[PDB]
Each structure stands twice: as C-alpha cells, then as structure tokens.
Design a protein around this ligand. Sequence first.
Ligand SMILES: C[S@@+](CC[C@H](N)C(=O)[O-])C[C@H]1O[C@@H](n2cnc3c(N)ncnc32)[C@H](O)[C@@H]1O
Lengths: 382, 107, 93, 98, 82, 42, 43, 91, 76
Amino acid sequence: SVPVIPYLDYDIVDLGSDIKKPDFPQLSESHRINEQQYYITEDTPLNKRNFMYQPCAANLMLDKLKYCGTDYFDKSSINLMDRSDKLAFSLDDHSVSVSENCGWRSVRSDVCMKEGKIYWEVEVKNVSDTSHIRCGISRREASTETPVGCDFYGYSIRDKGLQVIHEGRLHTVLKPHEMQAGDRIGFLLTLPSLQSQSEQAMDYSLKRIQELNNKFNKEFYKFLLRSCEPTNVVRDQIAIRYKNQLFYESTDYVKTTKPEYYDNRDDMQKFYELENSSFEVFVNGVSHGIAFEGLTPFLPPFSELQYNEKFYLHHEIRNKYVNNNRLGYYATLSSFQGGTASIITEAMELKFLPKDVDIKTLNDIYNEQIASDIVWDLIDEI
Amino acid sequence: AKAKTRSSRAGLQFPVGRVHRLLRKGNYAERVGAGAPVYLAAVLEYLTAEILELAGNAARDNKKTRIIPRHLQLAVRNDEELNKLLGRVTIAQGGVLPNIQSVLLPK
Amino acid sequence: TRKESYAIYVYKVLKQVHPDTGISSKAMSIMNSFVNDVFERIAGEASRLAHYNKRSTITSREIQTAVRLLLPGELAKHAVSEGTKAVTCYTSA
Amino acid sequence: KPHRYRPGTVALREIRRYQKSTELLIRKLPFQRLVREIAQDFKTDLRFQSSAVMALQEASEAYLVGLFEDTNLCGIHAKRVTIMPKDIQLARRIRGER
Amino acid sequence: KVLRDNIQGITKPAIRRLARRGGVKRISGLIYEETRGVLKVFLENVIRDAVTYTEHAKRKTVTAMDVVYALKRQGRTLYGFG
Amino acid sequence: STTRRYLNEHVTKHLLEGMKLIAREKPEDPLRVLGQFLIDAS
Amino acid sequence: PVAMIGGSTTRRYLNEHVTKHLLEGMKLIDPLRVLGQFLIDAS
Amino acid sequence: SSRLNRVFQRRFQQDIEAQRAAIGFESDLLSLNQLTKRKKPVTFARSAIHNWGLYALEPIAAKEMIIEYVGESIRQPVAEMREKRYIKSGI
Amino acid sequence: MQIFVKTLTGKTITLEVEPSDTIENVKAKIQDKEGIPPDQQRLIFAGKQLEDGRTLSDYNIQKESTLHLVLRLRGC
Ligand SMILES: C[S@@+](CC[C@H](N)C(=O)[O-])C[C@H]1O[C@@H](n2cnc3c(N)ncnc32)[C@H](O)[C@@H]1O
C-alpha cells in the first residue's frame, strides 16, 4: 500500500570512501566516573511504542527489497536501540554507566540466545554501597526502562549476595557473595535445542486452539493460531528516514499473562518451562550452582508481536505468534545511580573459560546473526 | 533600597528622572512638587505591571512565549475595568474579542 | 539621534511578573505609547486641578485626586495604595 | 448531488475565522490609492510616509468593525438577521455622527 | 496623474470580511455602497486634520504622528505608532 | 507466501547451517565450501 | 565497494564476498543438488 | 475579586527581591512558584459524584485557569510499579 | 548531623550542623547559603520559636527533622 522509499546521495557509496554506511552513533558528554568520560547517544533512535529499531543500509543490488538490516559495531556489543535515554557508555571500556541522578535502567546487547551453549563474562567496574547493577538474562519483551526481574521476560541477580531475581522477588538460592570493584561474572547458559523448542511450542499451539476454547469470535483467533508455525518468520520491517538518516522499525512483542496449561495427570495448572535449561554464574571462576532451570519457552505461542486487532480481523493477513530472528534471550545488563558494568565478548578477553565444545563465544552467534540477517531477507527478497 | 538614581530610593522600575523632567518641559503647571513624579511613576508602573501580567497570562494560554499585540487586546478587552479605562482607544494589529450574538447560532 | 522611550522600563517590569517571557517589538511600541497616553492623561487632569483651586504647584496630592478621577473603580483604590506606598519610601529614605 | 453546505454554515465559519485573526482585511494597494485620492482635495503633491498609510488603515478597519458590531445589534433588535442600510443609519444616528 | 473612483477598490468581499469580523451573518446587497459612503466620510475627516498638522509644520509628507494626532483629536486614540 | 512455503520447509534448515558455518571462520574461497556443505546433506 | 553498501561490520564482508553470486544462484531457482553446484560456479 | 490576589502576590516580589542579591540559591525564594498568582478560592468536600470533589467558591467565567496539577515527577516504568502496588494494597 | 530548614512557601535546604551548635550558628549557615541576614530569621520547631543563644539539644532537635524559617523582608 506504500512505495519503497528511494535512496539518497550518501546511500550510494563508492569504492574509495571509508565512511560507515549506518551513520555513526553521535555521542553526548554524560559525566566523569571511574576516571572516564562516558557518553549517552544523542541522535540515534531508541526503542519506543513497543518497537525495536535497527539501522538499515541501502543495498543497491537488491530489487524487491531495496535495503538490508545492519548493526553498528564490529564485534558483539550493546545495541543502542533498546536502552534508556540517560544510559551512558564510553568507547574505552564499553561499560554502561548511568549518572548518579539516574535510576534502574536496562541495556541489552544484540546477541540472541535461541539454542545451544553460549558463554561470556561481564566486567564490573564501580559498584559502591550507593551505586548498583543487575546483570543477567532477558528476552526482547523485557522493557529496558524497568530493571530486569519484575517479570517472566527476564532474570537476574542482585549485586550484594546475588539474590536471584524473578517476579520482583529476591531469592537466596545460590551461594551468596557480593560484588566489588574488580569481579567478573560468567554465564553458562545451557539451552534446549531448536528441535526440542519447536515441539513444545507446537504442543501449546494445539493445546490452545480448542483445548480451552470449548470474546465474540473464537475461530479467527484459532485461525491465527492455526497459522502458528514454530520457526517460520513473519517480519514487517520497513525502511524509514528519521533524523536525516535511514533505519528500520521492526514489530516488537507485547507483555502477556503466565503460560498455564492443565495437565490432567498431576491435577495442577502446570507451567511451561524449557527443557534442560541451566543458569550458572561464575564468581571469578568458581561456580555457584543453577539459579534457574525453568526458563520460559517463547517461540511462536508465548510471544505476541504487535498486531492490528481491528484491522486484520475484519478482512493477506499477518500472524501474532511468529518469529523474526530476534526471538529469544539476550545479553542483558542493568545500571543504577552510577553502577557500572561492562560486557566481555571474545575468548581472548576471557579469563575463566570452561572447557566445553558446545560453548561458543558471544561474538560467534553475533556472526550467525550476521549470517541469518541477510539470507533470511534474501529468501524474503523473491 | 539604594541612594542613587531616585527611582531606586522609592524602589521602583519606572524612572523618576525622566518623569520629573517631563512634568516641567510639558507645561502642566509652574512648579512641580518633588514628591509628585514619584507618585506619578508609581501609578504608571502599576498599570504597566497590570497590563503586562494579563498579557503574559494570555500568551502562555496560547502556548507562545513572547507577547504580540493580539495578546494585549485580549488582556484589555476581556478585563472589566481595564477595558473601561481604555474604552475609546484602538490597539493596532490587535484583532477583535471573539463573540457571536446568540440568534446567529443555529438551533 | 537619542530619542527617549520607555522600552527598557517596560522590559524590567516584564521580568518581574513573568520572568520567562519576552515581548515583540510591535507590542513594545504599544506599551511605549500606552504609558505616554496615561502620563499625558493624568498630568493633564492634575493640572486642570491645580488651577481650579488657584495653586501653582503640582503636589503629590493632585496626582492622587487625578488618579481617583481617571482610573475607574478598583484601579483607583490600588493605584492610590501603590502610589502612597512609593512616596513614603521616597521621603523616609 | 454533491456535498453542499447549508446557507449559513459558511457565515458562522467565516465569523469564527476572522474574529480569531488580526491581519488587515482591505488589500493595501486599493487602500493606498484611496487615501492619496482623498488627500488630493486638501493639498496637491503630498507624499505619504509608508507607516502613515498603515496607520490610516488600522483605524479605518477598526472603525467599520466597531460599526458592524453596533450595526448588527440593531438588526437583531428589529427581529432580523440581515443588516440593511436602515441599520447603519441608525447606529450612526444614535452615536451622533449623522 | 489625478485619479477618480478608487473607492470601488474597497471591494465587495473586503466589505463582507470586515462585516464577518464584526460578527454579522447575512448582509443585504445594498450595504456594499453604504459602507463605501461611510468610509469616505471617516477618511475625509481624519486626512483633513492630518494634512493640517503637516501643512503647519511646513512639511510635505504626512508622517505617522499626524495621523495619530488627527485620530487622537477626534477621540479615536491609536496606540501603536508612537 | 507460496515461494516462502517451499524454501522454508526444505531448504532453510541446512542452508542456514551452511551459512552460519562461514560466519564462524572464513576460507578465502567460502563459496566452494557453501557448495560443499550442500552436497553432504543430500 | 559493495561491502560497505550493506552497512559496516567487517563480518559483513559477505556482502562483497558471497551474497551476490548466491542470490543470482538462488533467484533462478527444486532439490538442493542444483544449488549445491550454483554456489560453485562463481569460482 | 481576583484583583486583590494579583496585587497580593505582586507585593511578594515587591518584598523578596530587595534582599536576594548575591545568593541567590533556590531556598524557596525562587519566585515561590509561577502559576500560583492565579489559583482560585477552590475547596474540597464530600462530593455528589464520589467521596471527595473540588468546588469553585467563586463564579469563574468561561476560559479561565483554575489550578495547576502538582505532585511527583516519575517516569513510565516506576509508574507501573506504583500503579500496581497501590492497587495491590488496594488504594 | 543533617537537618531541613524547610521554608514557608514550600522548598527545603540541607544543612550540616551539630546539636551543640547555636541557633545563630545555624542562622549563620542559612546566611552563607542564602545571604539572608540572621536578624530577619525565625527558626520554628514543634511550633516553638527558638532563641539565638540556645542550642539544638535544648529543643530536642533530632536527625533529619524539619525546621521552619520565616523571613521578614525589610520595608518596602
Ligand atoms: C483522578 S482520581 C479522582 C479522585 C477522587 N475524586 C477522590 O475523591 O479521591 C480517579 C477517581 O475518580 C473516581 N471516579 C472516576 N470516575 C468517576 C465517576 N464517573 N463518578 C464518580 N467517581 C468517579 C474513582 O473513584 C477514582 O478513584
């Protein structure tokens, strides 16, 4: 219903120019802590109104699509889209740092955790009695304004004693220990396989179409939920010119209630929990146990993307319960009142690296995100 | 408040140097009392304060920072006793008060 | 050449009631010419009034009978009160 | 048959538009060429300051508007909604102009 | 050159716009010449007093103060031009 | 979504597996190994 | 060249390196064996 | 009616401004708001439409500001905790 | 220890004092923070007007109390 937005002068690069096609994150002088000037982004968009953003690049060879999605930084790092407007980071240590008059925020790094084993460490610089941080894991659903842990879209641990955070509650289930100005936390997140994920997601799609559906029309929400595939993508990602640059708006997931399903076996409303998950933390190398084992399964039938419920029902038509390759848990970080935390990406900057062959570095799946982004859109280019 | 600049001594903003000059080179009477320009500058400042207050009020209620003559007509004519002082006068570039007589509305 | 007006003295009162606002020049020429009317209207009436009684001085007592005539209703009572309060402060200090 | 507005509901729009704006309502060139005609009868070869044609225009257009407020009251008083020249010539007669 | 009948430049919409602003709803067609017969009477007086202030100053240009003083004289004081 | 249905059913599983293969580390002729991985699945 | 036109990460050398010839292989396309050779033809 | 008020608050900048000369610092002399020199008489009592309402004690006319809304300044996240916590205790 | 000297129209300050400080010692600290002379200051605690020669311990002023300051601006 809308035409493809045409290119502009800076969009057609040439061999010689060394400028970077997603226009650089313009930084702003935030404050001085840890003997370092950190910086908030000033002129690059943030994720709002239940959107996620990504700088597009005009890709000249492509015909139906005229653009490609792109990230800014070379290796894996924080995507500056799902963060807060007072959340500062410097080009020196990549530690996120809010000012002392700013509160509990959240910052997500762009690497998705979908299946397999991913491990990385997170450096912690300045955690005083007055400045705090909450490191851990979250989906794309967890609002980066609130700190991770109020909901079932993220989990983390406290700074002092590492009280494990879910539903806002503080749980002393691990070994209690406090952060200081020099620790580093490592994350053995064991995930189920995408085959095992797909069947438990398909099971709920069958267990939700009619099994509790005996609202004024229940066929079309069943029809949308027929039409509920495990790994298939429905993406509406469109190029836009914002602030004199070029970007994508991607449809984002909404908050919803707890996935409950009546198993006739044990006679109790059972919770959907992922298979064989483990949330192990390193405290300077030592292991501390499994914080959570029952991670949510999310892939079609637990994440509702943004949907026009009065436009589509009346009628060609998209679906709520889809994938968009951004679906899963992320490297999630928070900061409070000057509490600084830095994310470590590569094996060369890791000190306590366990010896598993299934472990791949944080930069690795980032490249697999680089691998997935173009070729899924090449498939959508036909 | 101060001791120089005779308006400072009364604690005003409007000058009593300029007024006391203009009461003698204006030929209002022979000898101008030395109290007189002070009292006259006090009345002038009060009116300029009152008409700039209702002007500024109606400038924020139309979202604009500075004051253009359309606000000054709305400050005067909507008032009950500043319109009466300024009854015969006409403010340039200054619109009308919106009203429509009743029988002109439909029914 | 130097052609005096009340441009600044109106501005210094705008910063006392509404300290964040400014004023367009076309609506400064109005205020420049509003005060020059009330001046020549009060000093006018306060000079027919020092001449009906055969005085030859404009005291501060003519300027308050002149204000109690021209200014109507509640502008009379207030501009008398802020009148006398600013001449008392003059004589005392 | 297209969207035709009823007779009256462009009047009560043009009322509320024009009362809400401040701009001059008589085109400047057919007013400058009117003043210079009427000024001829008293002196020949008069230049006019550019401001002093605006200064004439701002008072004439605020006379007639103040007259049409005073006119329209007479119409309403006569149980009409139409102003006719037996209404202008009452507002002028009562105010003591003719 | 010497001109005549510029008053038909005070045109029929520009009479009804003034009328609209003064809040009138229906205008009889006989008005549009009556108003040009009022506006000529007004402008005659104001310019006749204004030229007289100019003529007195041994000047040949009707400045803005004259129009303001001619309007102040007939009791129609104009704030805005000094 | 007919051209989508075919490719996403059959091709995508091993196509992405060969595509995230070269994302790990590149040889100077990666297109050959992209060819090589597609033969091994069949 | 066209490495930078698909944005700027160094691991998106693929935009220069692999993408154009695979999409020209894919846009003619059917089993995976013909696509097994259609990624060989560029070298 | 609203005359005296507007002259009352006019006396407060006729007093406070004389001795604020070096400092300066907010300390409650920072004009001691704006948007207060117009507030109104308005009170609160048992409402006809709920527990507590607000009543104009003066015949206020057509387009005239009553009162600014005052309170805390909190962002959207911390709003949602407060929106649920008060209801969790049942305010 | 810390106090508030929260002034009549609505805003607060944060001072550092001792309970052994005189009220005039506290009135000096307000003047250092506001320039307002100590003679025009009245310090009010539990409704009681405190005297310049007396100390904070005398009036049971504790940690993080709110004191009340009511300036009298001169003249005119
Ligand atoms: C913005 S607050 C108003 C405060 C309320 N007047 C009081 O006494 O606390 C929202 C409240 O208005 C009340 N309310 C909302 N709509 C109402 C209505 N139509 N009639 C009566 N009360 C209503 C509800 O009780 C709700 O707690």
